[PDB]
Design a protein around this ligand. Structure first.
Ligand code: MG
Ligand code: MG
Length: 170
RNA sequence: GGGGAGUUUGACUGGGGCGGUACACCUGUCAAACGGUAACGCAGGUGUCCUAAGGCGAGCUCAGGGAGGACAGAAACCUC
């Protein structure tokens, strides 16, 4: 048997692009990201100052956004279609989440505009389960127990069964 | 305008002088489980800075570590 609603569902999908310098490149990356995600993304300032990468304290160097639900699985389907539903054993974290990256963006269904240029990005997905909001709600916060959490094997099974993908070793 | 006049040229202090400030303050210890308690005892700090680094209210949680993610690495950004 099974519990009808202890099943696995994706609860958020995070997209980010880290360009490493503020300016026209940054705002065009924000533009392509918001066109892809249908909503305005946000800028993240540099935490520290390191001159090896040519960055300083508190300038926007990356643009990221998060999605839930319908648009989340559509974007994830596009990304996995680009990655031909192929992932590696080490692509999955110990907490049940996973992710990957796309070297360039116009392949997943984005028209090439010569002005904006080309940009890669990182997809990440946080596998969830009904009741995970306990860990972050305000009134009576608590843990999510031991049985209810997600492990690497469960994430692998969910990926290979729902999206009929292949986990090549590596 | 030392030609001439009057006067002054601190204190502390293992003699005085040179050095130093133990000369006004602050922290720990000395200090002997109330408080107080000495030495040129020990380790140090002060003559500032702030329109917010003051005053309320709201919302968040930090250092670090582990596991993941294109360039990305020991270190850039995202997630748990
Ligand atoms: Mg005389
Ligand atoms: Mg006594």
């Amino acid at each position: 048997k099974e519990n009808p609603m202890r099943e696995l569902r994706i609860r958020k999908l995070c997209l980010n692009i880290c360009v490493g310098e503020s300016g026209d490149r940054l705002t065009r990356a924000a533009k392509v990201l918001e066109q892809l995600t249908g909503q305005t993304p946000v800028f993240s300032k540099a935490r520290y100052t390191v001159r090896s990468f040519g960055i300083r304290r508190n300038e926007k160097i990356a643009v990221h956004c998060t999605v839930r639900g319908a648009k989340a699985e559509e974007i994830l389907e596009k990304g996995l279609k680009v990655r031909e539903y192929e992932l590696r054993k080490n692509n999955f974290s110990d907490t049940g989440n996973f992710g990957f990256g796309i070297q360039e963006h116009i392949d997943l269904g984005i028209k090439y505009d010569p002005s904006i240029g080309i940009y890669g990005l990182d997809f990440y997905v946080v596998l969830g389960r009904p009741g995970f909001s306990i860990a972050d709600k305000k009134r009576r916060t608590g843990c999510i127990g031991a049985k209810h959490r997600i492990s690497k094997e469960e994430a692998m099974r969910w990926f290979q069964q729902k999206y009929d993908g292949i986990i090549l070793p590596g």
